[PDB]
């Protein structure tokens, strides 16, 4: 109802206003972002999956998830503090010979509501698309970083996955996970297995 | 010896609207409307 007393939210004639804070839900031989997402990861939004001789497991990237969560939190607080909301109106009454004032008051009251409704819907439908594009960009940066670290040691299958030519154990997987993967110690066996094939 | 890069999914049925597409399923969402 438009008539409010106290500290009250702003009145809009909208039925649904929902804002994205997460990813797109695309469910589903574990493959990368081209096939879809993984249900079995509950540590973070973005991450890795390793399958080797010792075992198979999932892991999450903490830094990218934390930066994304910080930007989405700032987005939420920007939406909340942008529209300061306070006592708006109580309504006025007019007699039978002040019809022009009554129509002017209705014109003002019905002209502000349209502007505020239009502004709220535009804000939601722009910020949702910005959030989704930001998530896709972050996944692309992780893929580029892992590719740039591995170079010629591993082959691309497409589908966001890499197959190691050499033998890569758990410390080898954690080396490319945390950003410190030294090239030369695994280069020779990878050269042999690449040239033999 | 395979490493892959992907993201997180669950069983949520929350839907939002964008400029290209309507009824887009998302993992998490916040309601800004009180009714």
């Amino acid at each position, epitope marked *: 109802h438009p008539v409010t007393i106290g500290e009250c939210p702003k009145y809009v004639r909208s039925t649904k206003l929902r804002m994205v804070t997460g990813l797109r839900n695309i469910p589903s031989a574990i493959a990368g972002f081209i096939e879809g997402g993984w249900t079995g990861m509950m*540590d973070g939004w973005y991450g890795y999956h390793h399958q080797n001789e010792q075992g198979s497991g999932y892991a999450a990237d903490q830094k990218s*998830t*934390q930066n994304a969560i910080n930007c989405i*939190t700032n987005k939420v607080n920007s939406v909340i*503090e942008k529209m300061n909301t306070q006592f708006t109106a109580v309504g006025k009454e007019f007699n039978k010979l002040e019809k022009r004032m009554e129509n002017l008051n209705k014109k003002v009251d019905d002209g502000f509501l349209d502007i505020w409704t239009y502004n709220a819907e535009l804000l939601v439908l722009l910020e949702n698309e910005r959030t989704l594009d930001f998530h896709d960009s972050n996944v692309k940066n992780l893929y580029e970083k892992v590719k740039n670290q591995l170079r010629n040691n591993a082959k691309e299958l497409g589908n966001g996955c890499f197959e190691f030519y050499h033998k890569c154990d758990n410390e080898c997987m954690e080396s490319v996970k945390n950003g410190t993967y030294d090239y030369p110690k695994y280069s020779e066996e990878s050269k042999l297995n690449r040239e033999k094939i | 010896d395979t490493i892959c890069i992907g993201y997180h999914a669950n069983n949520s049925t929350d839907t939002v609207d964008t400029v290209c597409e309507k009824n887009v399923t998302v993992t*998490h969402s*916040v*309601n800004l409307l009180e009714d």
Partner: antibody
Amino acid sequence: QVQLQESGPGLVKPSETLSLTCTVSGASVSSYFWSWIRQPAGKALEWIGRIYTSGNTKSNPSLESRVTMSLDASKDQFSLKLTSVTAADTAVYYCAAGRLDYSDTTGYYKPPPLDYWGQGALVTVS
Amino acid sequence: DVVMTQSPLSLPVTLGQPASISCRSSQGLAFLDGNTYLSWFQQRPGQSPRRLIYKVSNRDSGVPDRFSGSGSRTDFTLKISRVEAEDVGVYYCMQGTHWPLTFGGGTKVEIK
């Protein structure tokens, strides 16, 4: 009943390493976030850092270089290791536990809740 | 970090009178899950701290009904309707949204 008890040395010399252990009884260690909080005499509380069972320690930016935490499920013990101690580190130390939900993804990326506190141990540096 | 400001430092009240403590934040404390995460703690003299209010309005089990907290955006308030002899001590406000976890300055309650 979840009961937490602290034990450690009262006196440490300067430039040494201070160690405290927070023995937990009544509940498993895997179901909680574990945090350390220090308080100087007649001053404000200060948060040091937190740890969960799989393993990550996020500590306060100021005390990041000199802090190290660990947890053992066999003896149900939570440990602190503070290196290069100074006379400004004289404080009462508390260990706190908060609830962990494995389905909640975002809960790993905010400060943990503080539900069950501990008795506290006094450490002076002289 | 994020700065908490409490008012007043000392609030002497008489038995059977209401009291109010105010906590203010430099930043908004809303999280992306839809919550605020501000807590109110009590410390008796020579004892460990215990919690009174978890989140803006929710009250912990074992806490008396005279403790009520409310607030929004950047200003929050804890109110005690009746003050007894077990209400002495120092009260703090804490935020758990942004890294690192920051505590308030502290408000001391004395009986007149």
